[PDB]
DNA sequence: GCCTTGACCCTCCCCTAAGGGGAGGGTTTAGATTGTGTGCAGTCTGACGCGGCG
RNA sequence: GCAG
DNA sequence: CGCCGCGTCAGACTGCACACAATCTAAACCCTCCCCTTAGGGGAGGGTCAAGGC
């Protein structure tokens, strides 16, 4: 189509963004219903893992003795007072204790779905719900890379048929009777394989703890993890359908922030991040349109990024808000008084001390480019008028070397002991100076004798016999 | 320390190895306490401590514990200067194409992947996909997919194939390619097809692939995955005095890169929808592309000014980049500046330096002597003493400047005499006092000019200022050899007034004992300075052994020439002052003293000339009054007659007999004649208006008018200005060049009225604006010439070559523009030049032809000398000293180590501000000579040439040529070959408005397929009375004889084929259209009569000669020697064939027919013959006629421009630039070598390769030498530092980077950039020591 | 104007520009060519380095 | 003179009780709003190279 | 804006 | 393969003086960490002062 005719990233963004038609009032409701359907689907899948609801039950047991409050674990109930939640946790507890004692296998496979759809009633907070899902995630991910290294324990031995190797591995999972038929195959590969049949043992039996740790076996929670992925990827592509359809809301908001130190695309990217938060935190059951909430989050993200990354030397958000308040107060006083308000009267229009306002006024200036043309000459820039102030003048370098030579003369006009006491007492010809105790430990002498030595040496160097070379280094 | 400089691509591991830590945050500094923030663009932990030996938290503060890393904040304890050296790095969340290798044409990523830049850009801007590998599918590698094609070919082919988009895809492509398999496949696809430009594209890509294989560069390093962060002390954030900060723009660009990178990492951790992550990847790509080169892709990023940000590439590129602002020239200590003022008491070697400037430029020297002499106990005491300006620091200062020269420099330093060393003389003013004779070299007048003083610090620099640059060493110009320290306006007027003669001047005719008696008489008032007297003059001749021998004779002189003789050095003739000395006579006097007696007496002579000219110019009181502009009294009569004539032409135009065109032309010509009559009357009335008495009788002499003495001395002005003072100031031109039909009849002594003054300003502002805008046009040419020739040094003494160019005096038509002596003075002969009587060697083979040898050559009549040139020099990397010839500025052969490239480029480019923006009549006697002699005798007994390259020269009775013209083909010559004529003897006659068909042999007319009606229109006019024919042109005839072309043949009255002499092939006249045939079939025509007739500068010229720019309508040349034939005509572009005698015949052309072809079918041609006519292209001259031919063409075509404006440049200086243009070669046959066919190599490389091949018997490569203009030859050096500091830094640096070049620092720009000695001059010995101690 | 030693520029360590900042004269590109045209290699090398 | 030796003495860093004051960072804001606009610059010509394109 |  | 459009690349050198840029918006909560308040105490680290003996 129009592809290839522009390189501007903002034209490309707008062109690619406009291919998504907006949502109606009932479109947002459908998409939010799909999102919550995905998250309750992953809820009802993880309810198949019973240690999850035991964790939530012992969390309520923590709420029993005020380890937490109720608002931290449950945000509501669909089918907020502590009145209902007591019988709610009784409902989940009664289902758990009736599901515990049953071991069978079609007899014990409806009780789990009863558990899941009694647990569906809980509108969990993101904290606990995230905790359970990433917990079961890391559990089967470690045992799953364990299964994957059981497979690639054959690749170190040989290259092997996996399509013949998948028919064996599943379902026994407590023994090597699936591995016993591998030598009934006896193609060359399955020679090498069996010699590592010992170092697979500690792998192939250790998931046998989880075979009784969750109460389930690995193929059941395998399908549970698969339906977990289906549910969360269902919610993820539904949040994406609500983010992509409100990308013009971001632009309508972000055009109001344009020249405040950020490029247009920086603003709409930060607004996009805020919009993704707004989608994550939207409740359609409040009966409000998506624009009313999403505007709050988009405004937050955009103004926060302007506060953070629009200035070269960054000032905090508290000082950003103080500067904004000062500028608004000042443009009101300028309109009233008909002139610029002096910081003294600006200190009574605001209610801050006057030197605080003076330093706030000193803060706000932005650094000048060192390439600004001076007088718009464009052959003379600001940066070539800036001198290096850290250098020392070569007259001062010549003076320092002359002073070193003079000090060497004067200190050679002393005895070795006094010259050593002075060369250690100050840092002369050394990398460090020393205390009286360190110089005394160098001479196995207590500190006051070193002090006396150094005093008499300073007395000698003060004389008119040795000090006319040195006194010339003190400017009169 | 280091022998070369290597550039290459940067691996991401190499970048992580430069860095001292990752820059994770855009935080520059804290705002309350301005300490640098952690992980920021200014970090004390990454980039080192902000104070000397001090931790940022202050826990470690002294250099006791140095190098320790404070565990509280990890800043090291070391010098803060490490913030100028320690880089950091930004780890990019997604890859990002380097814009220099993506966009700088030709795109290297496009050239590598064989993928067009629009498809690459559509892939990386996330518009299209590209299948990085297909597998067992119908999708090849580089095949781009749009969105929907990828979307469906997903589920048709599953996940078998892999396609991607973005710079991740381009990096996967660049990593997934095998370079040697690709280059070998390119070689086998090269050896298959002979398409020329396809073979050239393949060779471009082959050289790129093998450059990636030779160097360690991997292709995928053209895609950034780690970014380097410049050290913070080079992008400083500094507090200004007012509490405000000033920053570099790189802090903005780095800050933006970091922001978009961190937001990309957040979007990747949030798993944003892919629209958002693609937009952020496009924005990070944009931000890195704006950091590296701002404004190259699309729109520049402007920050906070709506003024674009200065990126990393803009720091190193352009007139404000590092290379030109900071490396090739820099601000310098021990330097001052002041207004220049005269001080004519000085000697030639000294300037006047104010004491107040010398006390400051020499401050460490004075501190040294103040402590050495015990006057100060301490350098601080000495600082206070020179601040108080105590009376002893003035004696110390007189001591420290004593033999210490200073460099004085006036900008523009157009040529090397713009910097000269003078010994200082301390003066009391504030203006530098510049000795007058040097001003002409500096181009200095004292109207506000200022000069800069520099102090040579070391002993070597003091001895170079004494020995190389002192102004008593620079008395000759490096361009022509002529003296450049030469008297001027006041001096020459004083010496001209002194050496003139009045008729009855006081004290005439007396006899004088010598010059001292003349001076006594003149100072007593007893003889005028112009009294013609008889004075006894003792003068010394240089004997043949070298010693001086006296002679004494009463000369007839004036008193003033006698007085002037007292300052003339000894070995000079008296005839050198016994004349009225103008500017040219004094310049020749100084040149004579230099060539006879040498430098040391010439310097004393020049100062004596200045003092005596100043003195006697003062004595004359030569003043300009208004009566000095004498207007001829015949001016009003001349102007009234011209007005009568133009009014007659006007009332004739009312009578309609003349068009407005010829009315205007005749009015202009009868005002131009009036202007010249007025100027002649004015000058004749002015130049001899002194008519004075001798013994009563009146007698006219040259005038003593002040205006005329100033014009005639050469002091100031010319007759062209005296014309406007006293004659009329003539016809003006409008701004568009067309001259106004009525002139300014008034001159500046009268008034210009208001209208004439307005008309005057029309052209005055045009001249001033031309002056203002052509200095930038000339300075750029000079820069291009210096950069094409900067690395040419005289490196040998003799290359032993025997070739050379044949120097002849240049003769344009009927006058010599330059004699042989001016073109061979100072060059070295290449063969024994022998007398016109053969076998008597006049001059041996390898002699420098100094003035003695040129006088010997002029005693004889030698007209051509084969002489050694630099284009013909065997030395690779340099030139030998014998092939160059004489040092123009010293007058001896040139020393080994001289940077003749910079001298040649400055000598060409310094005069560039003085430039802008029919039958044959023999003139005087001589034997007529012709070249390309093919003659026949016409019906009337004349000679008529059967050739088109015949030219008519005139040998003189001594054997030399004195004029040469070029005759058109078949011109009727009234005087035959080898005959004598006199002045005005018209020899060759023709008419330019038509071209004849010359009869081959005498015979009868017949028509070879010249069909009536198919090839002609029959016409009948009454003026001559005869019927005739016109041959049909292309668009006006039938099918048939437009294709089969009409011819006419020779048949006698018997019906037999008559032939041409020597060859019995059928002789035909193949006639093209638009020809007038007024002969009938069966008429008797003698050979030589017509059978049918068919009708028909400045500074940019120098620029587009040295730039080798192809002319718009190039003269087509004959490639191979053969016989012309024709292919498919009437196509819009015809086809021509040349048929050699013993070579492969078919050789085609695409000659467009809208230009008249200037040869005929039956005859032969050879290499270089002009088939068509037009301005010749130097590439064609080089390919067809040779190297020396394009050398002769370029030096003739540049000296043509410089000789209009009276500028004398030598030809060594143009031959040096030509040699540097003929620096590449193109391999045609690869030989037993490593060079590929058709690829362009350095010429010396292929020459030394052939030398070592033929040394071991093997066959060498054959090459065609190429002509590159000075820009394309400056950018095709073997050094990326020279070529990158010249211009187009981005192209040079990207090409050198992907090729992995290595700069061995051989020229002069690379050694000025790194702060080393240049390998030319006094730093030549050091570089030879360096290459004799490292190669062994 | 005259300057022996003085204040030096910040990024690149060369002398500062004008006689208001105690200056230092620009030894431009053309003057470097003028010293390369004589053989003044040592004068040039001290104009560049020291 | 060479040492010791106990007695003083200085500066500097941290501590007191019960919070005050501020800097500098996090977080949510639920009627509903869904495509950037400068009253921009655009105004430099000539040479050269390369690539779509008939 | 200016100086050469 | 020849041509037209488009992009890129240049365009003197020193000096003074002058002088940048100028519009462009949140609030109410909470948290931690740092430094401050009296009237001196407590102690490490490091000098200093008269005395005495070698
Ligand atoms: C160091 C330099 C001397 C050369 C002095 C003399 C003129 C001064 C600038 C001007 O005052 C304008 C402006 C004032 C702002 O307040 C701070 C920035 C500006 C650019 C100043 C910077 C600096 O102070 C300058 C360049
Ligand atoms: Mg002047
Ligand atoms: Mg200006
Ligand atoms: Zn620290
Ligand atoms: Zn030679």
Swiss-Prot record, chain A:
InterPro entries: RNA_pol_sigma-70_dom, RNA_pol_sigma70, RNA_pol_sigma70_r1_2, RNA_pol_sigma70_r2, RNA_pol_sigma70_r3, RNA_pol_sigma70_r4, RNA_pol_sigma_70_non-ess, RNA_pol_sigma_70_r1_1. The record marks 425 as: Interaction with anti-sigma factors. Pfam families: Sigma70_ner (PF04546), Sigma70_r1_1 (PF03979), Sigma70_r1_2 (PF00140), Sigma70_r2 (PF04542), Sigma70_r3 (PF04539), Sigma70_r4 (PF04545). GO terms for cellular component: cytosol; cytosolic DNA-directed RNA polymerase complex; sigma factor antagonist complex. Residues 242-312 are annotated as: Sigma-70 factor domain-2. Residues 410-463 are annotated as: Sigma-70 factor domain-4. Residues 447-462 are annotated as: Interaction with anti-sigma factors. Keywords: Cytoplasm, DNA-binding, Sigma factor, Transcription, Transcription regulation. Disulfide bonds: none annotated. Its main location: cytoplasm. A motif (Interaction with polymerase core subunit RpoC) lies at residues 266-269. It is found in: Cytoplasm. It comes from the Bacteria. Residues 436-455 bind DNA. GO terms for molecular function: DNA binding; sigma factor activity. PROSITE patterns: SIGMA70_1 (PS00715), SIGMA70_2 (PS00716). The keyword Isomerase does not apply. Belongs to the sigma-70 factor family. RpoD/SigA subfamily. Sigma factors are initiation factors that promote the attachment of RNA polymerase to specific initiation sites and are then released. This sigma factor is the primary sigma factor during exponential growth. Preferentially transcribes genes associated with fast growth, such as ribosomal operons, other protein-synthesis related genes, rRNA- and tRNA-encoding genes and prfB. Interacts transiently with the RNA polymerase catalytic core formed by RpoA, RpoB, RpoC and RpoZ (2 alpha, 1 beta, 1 beta' and 1 omega subunit) to form the RNA polymerase holoenzyme that can initiate transcription. Identified in a complex containing RpoD, the RNA polymerase subunits RpoA, RpoB and RpoZ, CRP and DNA. Interacts with Rsd; this prevents interaction with the RNA polymerase catalytic core and with promoter DNA, and as a consequence, promotes transcription from promoters that require alternative sigma factors. (Microbial infection) Interacts with Escherichia phage lambda antitermination protein Q. The gene is rpoD.
From Swiss-Prot, chain B:
Zn(2+) 2 binds at residues 799, 873, 880, 883. GO terms for biological process: DNA-templated transcription. Zn(2+) 1 binds at residues 55, 57, 70, 73. Binds 1 Mg(2+) ion per subunit. Binds 2 Zn(2+) ions per subunit. The modification N6-acetyllysine is found at residue 942. SUPFAM superfamilies: beta and beta-prime subunits of DNA dependent RNA-polymerase. One of its GO terms (cellular component) is DNA-directed RNA polymerase complex. Its cofactor is Mg(2+); Zn(2+). Gene3D superfamilies: 1.10.132.30, 1.10.150.390, 1.10.1790.20, 1.10.40.90, 2.40.40.20, 2.40.50.100, RNA polymerase II, clamp domain, RNA polymerase Rpb1, domain 3. It catalyses: RNA(n) + a ribonucleoside 5'-triphosphate = RNA(n+1) + diphosphate. CDD domains: RNAP_beta'_C, RNAP_beta'_N. Mg(2+) binds at residues 445, 447, 449. Pfam families: RNA_pol_Rpb1_1, RNA_pol_Rpb1_2, RNA_pol_Rpb1_3, RNA_pol_Rpb1_4, RNA_pol_Rpb1_5. GO terms for molecular function: DNA binding; DNA-directed RNA polymerase activity; magnesium ion binding; zinc ion binding. Its EC number is 2.7.7.6. Keywords: Acetylation, DNA-directed RNA polymerase, Magnesium, Metal-binding, Nucleotidyltransferase, Transcription, Transferase, Zinc. It is an enzyme of class 2 (transferase). InterPro entries: DNA-dir_RpoC_beta_prime, DNA-dir_RpoC_beta_prime_bact, RNA_pol_asu, RNA_pol_N, RNA_pol_Rpb1_1, RNA_pol_Rpb1_3, RNA_pol_Rpb1_3_sf, RNA_pol_Rpb1_4. Belongs to the RNA polymerase beta' chain family. The RNAP catalytic core consists of 2 alpha, 1 beta, 1 beta' and 1 omega subunit. When a sigma factor is associated with the core the holoenzyme is formed, which can initiate transcription. DNA-dependent RNA polymerase catalyzes the transcription of DNA into RNA using the four ribonucleoside triphosphates as substrates. This is DNA-directed RNA polymerase subunit beta'. It comes from Escherichia coli O157:H7.
Curated annotation (Swiss-Prot), chain C:
Belongs to the RNA polymerase beta chain family. The RNAP catalytic core consists of 2 alpha, 1 beta, 1 beta' and 1 omega subunit. When a sigma factor is associated with the core the holoenzyme is formed, which can initiate transcription. This is DNA-directed RNA polymerase subunit beta. The lineage of its organism: Bacteria, Pseudomonadati, Pseudomonadota, Gammaproteobacteria, Enterobacterales. DNA-dependent RNA polymerase catalyzes the transcription of DNA into RNA using the four ribonucleoside triphosphates as substrates. It comes from the Bacteria. It comes from Escherichia coli O45:K1 (strain S88 / ExPEC).
